[PDB]
Design a binder for this molecule. Sequence first.
Ligand SMILES: O=S(=O)(NCc1ccc(S(=O)(=O)c2cccc(O)c2)cc1)c1ccc(O)c(O)c1
Ligand SMILES: O=S(=O)(NCc1ccc(S(=O)(=O)c2cccc(O)c2)cc1)c1ccc(O)c(O)c1
Ligand SMILES: O=P(O)(O)OC[C@H]1O[C@](O)(COP(=O)(O)O)[C@@H](O)[C@@H]1O
Ligand SMILES: O=P(O)(O)OC[C@H]1O[C@](O)(COP(=O)(O)O)[C@@H](O)[C@@H]1O
Ligand SMILES: O=P(O)(O)OC[C@H]1O[C@](O)(COP(=O)(O)O)[C@@H](O)[C@@H]1O
Ligand SMILES: O=P(O)(O)OC[C@H]1O[C@](O)(COP(=O)(O)O)[C@@H](O)[C@@H]1O
Ligand SMILES: O=C([O-])C(=O)[O-]
Ligand SMILES: O=C([O-])C(=O)[O-]
Ligand SMILES: O=C([O-])C(=O)[O-]
Ligand SMILES: O=C([O-])C(=O)[O-]
Ligand SMILES: [K+]
Ligand SMILES: [K+]
Ligand SMILES: [K+]
Ligand SMILES: [K+]
Ligand SMILES: [Mg+2]
Ligand SMILES: [Mg+2]
Ligand SMILES: [Mg+2]
Ligand SMILES: [Mg+2]
Lengths: 436, 425, 425, 422
Amino acid sequence: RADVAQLTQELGTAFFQQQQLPAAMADTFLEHLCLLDIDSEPVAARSTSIIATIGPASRSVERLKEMIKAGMNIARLNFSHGSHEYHAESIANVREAVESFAGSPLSYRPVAIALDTKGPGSGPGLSEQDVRDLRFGVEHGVDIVFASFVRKASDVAAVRAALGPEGHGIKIISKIENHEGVKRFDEILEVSDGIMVARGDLGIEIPAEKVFLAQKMMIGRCNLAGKPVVCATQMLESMITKPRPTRAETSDVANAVLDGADCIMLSGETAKGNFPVEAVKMQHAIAREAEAAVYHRQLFEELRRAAPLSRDPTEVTAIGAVEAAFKCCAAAIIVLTTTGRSAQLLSRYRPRAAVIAVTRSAQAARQVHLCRGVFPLLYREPPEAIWADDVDRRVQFGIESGKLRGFLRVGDLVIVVTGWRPGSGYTNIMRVLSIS
Amino acid sequence: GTAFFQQQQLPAAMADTFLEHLCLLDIDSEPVAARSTSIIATIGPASRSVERLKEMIKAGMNIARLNFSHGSHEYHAESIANVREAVESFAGSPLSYRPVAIALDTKGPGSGPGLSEQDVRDLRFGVEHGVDIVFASFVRKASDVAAVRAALGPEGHGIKIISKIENHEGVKRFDEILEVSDGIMVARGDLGIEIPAEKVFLAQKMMIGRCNLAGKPVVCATQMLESMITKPRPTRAETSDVANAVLDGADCIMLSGETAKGNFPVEAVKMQHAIAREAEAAVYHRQLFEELRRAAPLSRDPTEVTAIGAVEAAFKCCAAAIIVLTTTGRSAQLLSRYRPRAAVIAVTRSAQAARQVHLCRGVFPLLYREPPEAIWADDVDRRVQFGIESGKLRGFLRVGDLVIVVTGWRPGSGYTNIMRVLSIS
Amino acid sequence: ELGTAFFQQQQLPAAMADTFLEHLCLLDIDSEPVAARSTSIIATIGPASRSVERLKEMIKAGMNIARLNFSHGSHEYHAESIANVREAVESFAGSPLSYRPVAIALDTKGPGPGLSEQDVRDLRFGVEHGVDIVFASFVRKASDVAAVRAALGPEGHGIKIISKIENHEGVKRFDEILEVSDGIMVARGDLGIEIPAEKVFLAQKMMIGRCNLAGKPVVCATQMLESMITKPRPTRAETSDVANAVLDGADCIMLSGETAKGNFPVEAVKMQHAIAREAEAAVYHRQLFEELRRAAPLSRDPTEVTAIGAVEAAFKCCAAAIIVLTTTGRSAQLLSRYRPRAAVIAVTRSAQAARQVHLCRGVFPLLYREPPEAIWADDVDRRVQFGIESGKLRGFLRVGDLVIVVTGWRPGSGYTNIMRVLSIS
Amino acid sequence: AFFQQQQLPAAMADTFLEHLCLLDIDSEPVAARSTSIIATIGPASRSVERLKEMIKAGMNIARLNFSHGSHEYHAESIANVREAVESFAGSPLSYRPVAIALDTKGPGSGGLSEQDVRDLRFGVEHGVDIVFASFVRKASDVAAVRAALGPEGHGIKIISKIENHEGVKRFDEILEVSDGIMVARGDLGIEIPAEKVFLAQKMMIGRCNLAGKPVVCATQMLESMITKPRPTRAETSDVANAVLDGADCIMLSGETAKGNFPVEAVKMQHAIAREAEAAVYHRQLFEELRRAAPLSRDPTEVTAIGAVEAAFKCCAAAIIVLTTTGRSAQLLSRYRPRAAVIAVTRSAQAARQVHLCRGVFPLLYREPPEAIWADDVDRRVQFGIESGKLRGFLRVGDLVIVVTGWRPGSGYTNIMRVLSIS
Ligand SMILES: O=S(=O)(NCc1ccc(S(=O)(=O)c2cccc(O)c2)cc1)c1ccc(O)c(O)c1
Ligand SMILES: O=S(=O)(NCc1ccc(S(=O)(=O)c2cccc(O)c2)cc1)c1ccc(O)c(O)c1
Ligand SMILES: O=P(O)(O)OC[C@H]1O[C@](O)(COP(=O)(O)O)[C@@H](O)[C@@H]1O
Ligand SMILES: O=P(O)(O)OC[C@H]1O[C@](O)(COP(=O)(O)O)[C@@H](O)[C@@H]1O
Ligand SMILES: O=P(O)(O)OC[C@H]1O[C@](O)(COP(=O)(O)O)[C@@H](O)[C@@H]1O
Ligand SMILES: O=P(O)(O)OC[C@H]1O[C@](O)(COP(=O)(O)O)[C@@H](O)[C@@H]1O
Ligand SMILES: O=C([O-])C(=O)[O-]
Ligand SMILES: O=C([O-])C(=O)[O-]
Ligand SMILES: O=C([O-])C(=O)[O-]
Ligand SMILES: O=C([O-])C(=O)[O-]
Ligand SMILES: [K+]
Ligand SMILES: [K+]
Ligand SMILES: [K+]
Ligand SMILES: [K+]
Ligand SMILES: [Mg+2]
Ligand SMILES: [Mg+2]
Ligand SMILES: [Mg+2]
Ligand SMILES: [Mg+2]
C-alpha cells in the first residue's frame, strides 16, 4: 500500500481500479488471478496487432475502410489461392482504403501488407511458384512475407535471396508448421525477423493435443529474443458463419495475448466468412481485456533478468525508459525511429505505456505493427534547418497526435526517447516530460 | 536415469523463471503421470446406452452429469440405472474398478428470486436416487446455497453442492457463495450472455484462482470442444481452451452437447483426456507449490499439517504417489489443494466418497470392499497394500518407486496425522 | 486460538515479511524471545574455568561444549580438566530439570607438513579419555583430515572431526576439506594473520554458507567478546559480532580467553546466551527455509525426505517442538539443516550422541536410560512420552501444544521414515 | 578477468545462499570506497599535518564533539581541518571536499539545553555542514534544533542521534522531520539491553534505506585500535556488517579523537568498507529497493531509477550527475547502484554534505563559465569525466550514464544519457 499511497492520493482510487491495476500490482501470480475483475475497464489503446486475411468477403474498398476502423493493422494476402492479377487488385484496394484517411495526418492509420507464400509442397526447398510470388511482392512493395513451411535456416536464406537487392527492407516472418520447424526453431528464429505459429498445418503434422506446447514455447522464445511472434488459425473459426464466437474461441484469443503474442490473425473469418468486420471487432475487444490482465510485475522482472547485459546505447536507453515509464505510470513512451528498431527494443520489455513511434519512413510505420504496443505516426513535414529543432517538432507531433487520439492528457507524464545525432543506430537519450 | 528427467516436462518444471519454463516446453517430452483433471460428461441420447457408457468409462469419464433442464424423472432414473450398470460391469476386478460420480445439474430459478418448486422436487429425486453432487444453477448469493442444502434434507447431508456462477451477481457475490459451497462451476454459456463475451476469461481465471486458494473444487464448463458435436477432430482454439483451463487450475473439465447429443462422445472424452495429460505436465510446479504453501494459512488441524508435510516430502523424492486412507475424502482433498505432481491414491470403503473425490484434481479413488480385520493396524496395512497393488496394475507404481503413505492414529473421520516414506517392493 | 500477544513475540511480524527489507524494518526491540537458545556455546577450559564449582556456574549459564586447548598444558592437566567437567555435569543427574549433557572437545596443537608427533599422542589421549569432538588445527587439504581420522585409531571412529580453517590454503581447498570433515571451525585468530584482516568476514560468511548448504556444523570462533577478558560488559562491536555470526548461520559460537583466562568467564557465557536468543528470533525463516529447500538436492533417502516434511509441518502449525528418536544423532542433524523455528528434542539411548548433537543448531538432547520394552512399538511410545514430559518440565511444551514426532519403521539406525502430528495431553 | 573481480560471481547468484557460497577472498575490490568515514577530531587528530594524513587515508567528514572542549578549541579544530583540506585545492581534478559536523552535548537531565543553543549558533557562525543532534526523543526535538539554527542555518543537515528507548519507539516521526539518523550505539547500549542493540541498528538502517535518507553507524567499531595497531576479529566483522546492513556512513570516535593510531583506524575502515561493498548482493537488493520505493510523478525520482537501471544494464563505470543541492545525487544513491555516482556541483556546501549519501563522489566545479547554458552543462559533464579518469573511476571505452536537467536551477533533473568514454 505505501508503495502506491501518494500516487493513489494524486491520481485517485478510480485510476487504480481500472485496467486490472490491483491484479497487476499483486505480490504473487495466485493473488494476481484472484484480483482479476470483470468491472475493471481497459483504458489503454489496444497493443496486439490484428492481421486480417483479404479475400472475397473483405476485398471491396468500402469493406476495407470498415475493417481499418474496426482495428485491422496488417492485411494478409494468401498466395495459396488467386492469381497475381487478383492479388494486385487486393493490394490496390487496401492502399485506396488506407489513403482515404490521409487527409488528417494527426489521426492517419498505416496498414502493412503481408504476402503469405504457397509453400514448398512436396519439394525440399523454395518452389518455382514461390520465386515468382516473392518477385511480385517486391515489385508491388509488400512490407512482410509470411514464409510457409520453414524447416531450417537455409529455407529463410532462400526466401531472402528470392526477394533480391530491392527487397532488403521486407520483413521475413517464418511460419512453423511441422515437427522439423519446431525442432530447428532456434536456428530459424536466428535468421528470421519473426515467427508465425501456423496452428492449422502444425495441428496435422504433430498431435493436436501438443500444439499448445509448441505455441507457448515459440512465443516464449520470441519474447526472449525480442522478435515478433504471430498466433494464427481458427482463433474465431465459428464466426465464419455465426455473428458471435464460442467460449473456447474468446478464451483462445485472450490466451494468445496472455502467452505473449505480438499479433493475432484472422484467416477464413475475414477472407471468406459472413462477418469479417465483426471478427476484427471481437479480436480488438478481447485483446484490450487480455492486455490489461498481463501480470507486468513478474513479467518485467523476468524480461529484465533474461535480457543479457548490453553495451548498445539503444538497448540501454530502452530498458531505462521502460523502467521510468513503470515508475510514474507514464501514459506513453514517444520514440523517434528511422527503421523502427528503437521502438522494437522498447516493445521487448512489454511496457504498459503505449510506444508512440514517430517516423518519416512509410515502410517502417507499416512494419512496426509487428511489435506489440507500438503505435506508428508517419511524419510528412520537410526537415528544419537546425536538426535539434527538427527533433523537437517530431516530438511535439507525437504529443499532439497523442492528445488528439486520447493517449495523452494534460498533467500526464511521458517518456521521450531520442538520439544524439541524425541517422539510424544512435538512440541514447531518455527524457521525462510533463504534458501541458 | 537421464530418460526420467527428460519426460513429463521435467526440464521446464525445474526452470528458475516462468519465461525459461515456457522456453523449455518440449513436444517430444511425453507425459508419464496419470491424468489428474477429471472429465465430467453430460448424459443424453448419445451416451445413454450401457455399452456406450462402458466405452466412455474406459476413455476417461469420471463424473456423469444429468441435466435436469431436459427430461422427466423417469428419464433421469433410467440414465442413473444405465450409468450404475456400466460402472458395476467392471466391479469383478477390484484392483482396476473405476468409480463414477453422478451429478444432478438443476433447471434453475428462471424468472424467480430463489429456489423454484421444480428444483425442490428434482433435489428430493436426487437424494432418493443417491446422487453424489448437485450442480446448482444460477447461484446469486449465499442464501441460494442454503436453500439447496435445506431442500436436500437430513438424508442428503453428504451430497456436494457445486454452485454454478452464471451471471454478474454471482461473480460479484463470489466470496460469500464459495464460503458456503463445496465448490464452483464456471458456467461459461450463460455467463457469456449475462456479461460481455470478451470478459468471460477474466471471470474464469479469477474464480479458478480463488477456488485454488480456498482448496475447493472448480469446474470449467461449456463449449470446450463444441465442434466435436459434428466433427471428429476439434478446432485449434478448442484444444487450446482445454489446455488453458487445466493450466489455469481447474479441477474438472466438462463436456455438454459433445457427449449428450453429439456424434463423437467417446472421442470427445478421449480428446479431453489427451489434452489434460499434456497440460498437467506443463504446470510450473516450482512457483505453483511455493505460492500455494505461502498463501495457505497456518493451521492447528493435524490433517492440514500432515497434508503439507506429505506434499513437501513427495516433491523431495519425486514420489510416484501419495497413498491416503480416507472416509469422507477430506484427507485426499487437503493433499490435492497443494497440487502435488505425485498422484493421490485415495483408498476408501465409502462408495460415495470414492465417487465424490473425482472433484479434486489428482485424486484417484480406490473403493475397498473387504470386511474389516479384527486388528485395526492390520486393516490399515491391508488397505495400503490394496493401494500399492492397484497402483502397480494401473501403471502408477513400479518396484523401486518411493511412495508417501498418509494415515491416522484411530478409526473414524478427522484423525489423519501420520506421513510415512515407503519404498515399493 | 493463540492470541495477538503470541504473534508479537519472537520477531514473528519480521519473520512473516514478504521481503528482507520489510523483515529488517519490522525488527522490534520490544518483541521478546520465547524459544530456547539454539546456537551452542563452546567455552574454553583454563585456569579461570577449571574448578568444579566454577564449571557448575558455566553449565547453568549455558555452556554446552567444553574445549580443551592442547596448545598449553600437559596430559595430566587435561585429564583433570575432563574429570572436573564430568563431575560438574553429573552433579545435576538427580534433577531432570537441571541435567544437561556437555560435550568434550579436544583442540589440537597443530602441525611441519602434516600431522605432528604431539598431535598423534594428543589424539590417542582423546580416544582413551572418551572425547566427543576434535577441533583439528590448521587443516589445509583433505589428506590432513584423513591423517587425523587414522590417528583416531581402532576405537575412535565415532569422534567428530571439526576442521579448523586458519590459512589461505584451507580457504582455497575448503570444498575438499568439508567433504571429508564432520564440520568446520572458522578459526579467525590465525586466519586474520594468514590473510588480510579485512577479508576474514568474507571467508567466515562463505564457509558458514557452504556448511549450511552441506548440512554440516560450523563454529564461529575467536575474539567474539574479547574485551570481556578484563571488562564486565562487551563493546558494541562484540555484541554485533555474536549476533551476526548467528544470523550468518553458525551452529556454534565460541569463547577462548574470555572463559579460559579472563576475569568474567560466567558473564561471557551469559552474554553469548542472551545475544544468540535475540539473534535466533531475528532469523528470516521465510526466505531461509525456501532457499535451504531449493538448494538441497532431491533425495531418495527416507531420513532426508522425512526431515523436510517434518520441518514443513512444524512451520505450518507453529509446533512447540520436533521430537526425534535418534541413536547416532543423524536424524536430528537432518532436521537441524532446514533451520526450523521449533526446538528439535532428540531422544537417544547414546550418551556420546547426546553430547555430540550440541554441534547442530536447535538440537536439545535427552539421554534415555530406561530398560528396553519387549514390544518395540511400546519402547518407541515410551521414548516419545519421555521427550514430551521432559519438554513439559523444561518449559518447551504445555497441554494443548502441537509437536511433530519423527521416528522410523523398525529398530536400528538409518530407518527414519515417519512424521506424526501430535497434540500434547 | 573483469567478471572475477569485485565479487561479481557472488553478485550474480540466484539465491542469497549461493551468493554467500561464492564469496571469494581472492576476488579483489575494484570500485572506489562508497561508505563515508566520519572521524572525530581531538588531541590525537588536531594538527594540520595529522589531518592531511587522515584526508589521504579516507576521512570524509570531521566530527567535533561539543561534549568536550570550549568554543575556542573547536574553532581552532575547524580552522585546522579547513587548512588541511585546502592544501590539496591546487589540483582541482583531485581535490577532496571534507564536511564539518557538530555533535551536540545534549539535553542531559533536561528538551534543548541552553548550551546546545549557544553551540548551534557557533556552528552557524562557523559554517558547519551537519549537526549530529544528541538524544533526539521526538519530532519536536528536531524542530527545536532547526529553530536554534535560525534563518542563517537553513541549509545545515540535521542528523538525529537515536540513543534511547523513546527515540527507537518514536523513530518514524523523528526520521520524517530529520535529514538522516545516527545509530548512537554507546548510549543506546546503556539505555536498552546490550543484546538488543543489533536489532535497533538493523531496523533503523532498513527504515532509512527505505526512506532514502542517510544513516550513520557509530561507536566502538574499532575500539581496541585506541591502544593497539590492529583491531580484533569482532571489530572488523562489525564494520563489515554495518556496511552490509546498509549504512551510508561509518564512524570513529575515541579511535581518532584520543587514540594512538588515528590514521591507521581510518585506513582500516577504508579497507573493510571496500571489501564489504563488493560483497553486497545487488541482485536482490536492487529488486527490493525498486519494489519498496513508491510510484512517483517527480521527474528527478523517475530519472534516478531509469539511470540506475541503465547503469546496471551496461555495467556503467559511473553515473555523472549535475546537482545544485545534492538532491539528484541522493535520489540515485537510494537505489544502491554498483556504478559510482560522480556528483558535479558548484556549491561547496552541497559537495561536503553529499558525503552523507553512500556512493556519491562530490566534485567541486571551479572551472570558468560557458556563455551558452548547454555548453556549460556539457563542460560540467566533461569535467566529471576528466576527474573520473584521473582518479581511476573511468577509462577510455567505458560507458557512463549522464543525468542532467532541461533548464538551470535546482529541481529540474529529467534527462538520462548513455555516453561512451572518449
Ligand atoms: O505474466 S507472467 O509474469 N506470469 C508468470 C506466472 C507465474 C506463475 C505461474 S504458475 O506457477 O504456473 C501458477 C501460480 C499460481 C497460480 C496458478 O494458477 C499458476 C504462471 C505464470 C509471465 C508471462 C509470460 C512470460 O513469458 C513471463 O516471463 C512471465
Ligand atoms: O535470512 S536469509 O533469508 N537472508 C536473506 C537476505 C537476502 C537478501 C539480502 S540483500 O539483497 O543483500 C538486502 C540487504 C539489505 C536490505 C535489503 O532489502 C536486501 C540480504 C539477506 C538467509 C540467511 C542465510 C542463508 O544462507 C540463506 O540462504 C538465507
Ligand atoms: O530506431 P533507429 O532506426 O535506430 O532510429 C533512431 C534514430 O532516430 C533519431 O532519434 C533521429 O534521427 P533522424 O534525424 O535521422 O530522423 C536518431 O538520433 C536516432 O539514431
Ligand atoms: O479424510 P477423513 O475422512 O478424515 O478420513 C481419514 C481417516 O481414515 C483413517 O485413516 C482410517 O480410518 P478407518 O479405519 O475408520 O477407515 C483414520 O485414521 C483417519 O481419521
Ligand atoms: O538418527 P538415527 O541414528 O538414524 O536413528 C534413527 C532410528 O531411531 C528409531 O526411530 C528408533 O530405533 P531404536 O528403537 O533402535 O532406538 C529407528 O526406527 C530409526 O532408524
Ligand atoms: O540536484 P538538484 O539540486 O535538483 O540540481 C539539479 C539541477 O542541475 C541542472 O542539471 C544544471 O543546472 P545549473 O545550470 O543551475 O547548474 C539543472 O537543470 C537541474 O535542475
Ligand atoms: O498456413 C497456415 O496459416 C496454417 O497452417 O495455419
Ligand atoms: O449451465 C451451464 O453449464 C452454462 O450456462 O454454461
Ligand atoms: O585456534 C583458534 O581458534 C584460532 O587460531 O582462531
Ligand atoms: O553519542 C554517541 O554517539 C553515543 O552515545 O554512541
Ligand atoms: K499460404
Ligand atoms: K441445468
Ligand atoms: K590449539
Ligand atoms: K556530543
Ligand atoms: Mg499452413
Ligand atoms: Mg447455464
Ligand atoms: Mg589457531
Ligand atoms: Mg551519546
